[PDB]
Amino acid sequence: MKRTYQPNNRKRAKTHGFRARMKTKSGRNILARRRAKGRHQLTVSD
């Protein structure tokens, strides 16, 4: 009974990846929003 999470590394990083977020002002906003919150992770890149 198929589940929501089928992992896929190229998909996980093509979406969600730091280079992917940097392409868009929303994603650069996600990046700085995380740097400010001070997360250790910041992206699926880590």
Closest distance between Mg ion and the C-beta of residue 24, in Å? 13
Find out whether 31 and 22 touch, Cβ atoms under 8 Å. Answer: yes
Closest distance between RNA and the C-beta of residue 23, in Å? 8
The residues binding Mg ion (CB under 5 A) are 3-4
Three-state DSSP class for 40? coil
Closest distance between RNA and the C-beta of residue 21, in Å? 7
| Cβ partners under 8 Å of residue 42, min gap 6 | 18, 31, 34, 35
Residue 8's binding partner, choosing from RNA, Mg ion, none, with beta-carbon cut-off 5 to 8 A by kind?
A: RNA
